[PDB]
Amino acid sequence: AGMDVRESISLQNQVSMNLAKHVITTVSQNSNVIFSPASINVVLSIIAAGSAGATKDQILSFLKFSSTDQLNSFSSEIVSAVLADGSANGGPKLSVANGAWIDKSLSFKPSFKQLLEDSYKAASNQADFQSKAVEVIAEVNSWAEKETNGLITEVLPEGSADSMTKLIFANALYFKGTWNEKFDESLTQEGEFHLLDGNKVTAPFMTSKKKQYVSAYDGFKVLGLPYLQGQDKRQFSMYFYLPDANNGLSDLLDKIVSTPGFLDNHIPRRQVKVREFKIPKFKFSFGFDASNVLKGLGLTSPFSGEEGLTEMVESPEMGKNLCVSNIFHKACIEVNEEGTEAAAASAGVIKLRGLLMEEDEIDFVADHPFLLVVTENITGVVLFIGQVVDPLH
């Protein structure tokens, strides 16, 4: 067809929430999740580019773009700019690891290797999966560690690739940002978090008396926490989606998944007065092989010998029945008090106005499971989706 990048992104983000739903289905009740839909979609764009026929088409439709050219450009023009490190300019720190390895019984078309290098800044290599799978795993891990300056350490789990492994992708996204408004660490206090299994646990909750970006909706609330920008043009924020009910998470995610444009429509844009305001600290990483959940969402062709990836390698006999073995992804997230030390003080106009008006106050107390979304606000691109079901792990 033909379509605006804004609507592409809006469609993608909805599919991404359903992907998040399916990932959550594969972990235990109390397992935290964090992953980067953008990075996943970067891999799928790479795969589309090395494919054709019903396979190219199936991925094209999954990703909401009409051609491989559209994908390629959206990646290099938009996604990479969004995924670029911002620390040099005072914005958040981001680091990306992006690569493909194929059993050395094969070889990529030189042309494919250049596309990966140019539109994607992605490595491509051969490996001896057939006889040295254990070494290849360590090699890929060392490589990812090198690409992320030691930040991400183990994209492939032990025993994840073997003598049958033919084609893998390894992808990682590290992000660390300073809040636009620090929390006073002196105010952090222990408190009860209510687990989905019915039990409670004691955990550090941050608090504040400053005004917050919070909106209430039917059955849930949303909090936005902007990241310090510096000279970075991008504007990152983290959003918290908090069901009213302690066990409401699953239903809230069902609502999100079934409502087109949900994310575009639940962005709190006004700082309002909070009465009770509690945010649990948390810090964790999360990794998975995307191949199975994607098959679950019906994106089956890249992983089936049926069609294959005939535009990726050189031997048409090898390219026939060649498919993706694994898509290894790793992400990590952290929430603490750290905010900018360089803020200009506020004039206090709105505070003064409050001495003359009756401003309505609101609670946002995240003492139970909530969803997480990290987005770049200018493009609307989503860096991370996650769930915090247990702050202590």
- CA-CA distance, 224 to 227, in Å (whole number)? 10
Which position has the token pair 């409502």? 259
Q: Show the CA angle centred on residue 357, arms to residues 351 and 363, nearest 5°.
A: 70
CATH of segment(s) 1-178+280-337: 3.30.497.10
Q: Encoding tokens for residue 249? A: 């998470």
Q: What angle do CA 204, 208, 212 make, to 5 degrees?
A: 120
- Look-up of token digits 């990682």: 172
Place of tokens 């048409």: 316
Q: Where in the chain is the domain with CATH 2.30.39.10?
A: 179-279+358-387
Return d(Cα 160, Cα 182) in angstroms, integer.
40
Q: What is the resolution of this structure in A?
A: 2.2
Using what technique was this structure determined?
X-ray
Which residue bears the tokens 């699953």?
250
Other Cβ atoms closer than 10 A to 322:
24
Quote the CA–CA distance of 100 and 169 in Å, as a whole number.
5
Domain at 179-279+358-387, CATH class: mainly beta
Whole-number Å distance between alpha carbons of 199 and 378: 40
Cβ partners under 8 Å of residue 385, min gap 6: 16, 17, 19, 20, 33, 34, 35, 37, 371, 372, 373, 374
Tell me where in the chain the CATH 3.30.497.10 domain(s) lie.
Answer: 1-178+280-337
